[PDB]
């Protein structure tokens, strides 16, 4: 249900580059550049951007190609 930023940090195992991919991803949702693949959970843009990292729908090369 809610965002799980604890287990998502264990997949990449960096906890420092995860917020870098989440910053450029959450900025595209607020400006309206791209539509999120996962359905909206009636939350802010900073929450949906963290759930897409653990699901594997977005990545460093995926977010770079969308811009």
């Amino acid at each position: 249900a809610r965002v799980t930023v604890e287990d998502c940090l264990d997949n990449v195992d960096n906890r420092f580059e995860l917020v870098m991919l989440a910053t450029k991803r959450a900025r595209q949702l607020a400006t309206g550049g791209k539509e999120p693949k996962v359905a909206w959970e009636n939350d802010k843009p900073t929450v949906v951007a963290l759930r897409e990292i653990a699901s594997g729908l977005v990545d460093e090369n995926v977010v770079q190609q969308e811009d």
Binding site: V5, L9, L18, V19, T23, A26, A30, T46, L50
Partner: peptide, 16 residues
């Protein structure tokens, strides 16, 4: 800023 909201949810959160 948006960069600070993602910082408080990854490292400075109470569950981490």
């Amino acid at each position: 800023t948006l960069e600070a909201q993602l910082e408080a949810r990854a490292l400075m959160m109470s569950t981490n």
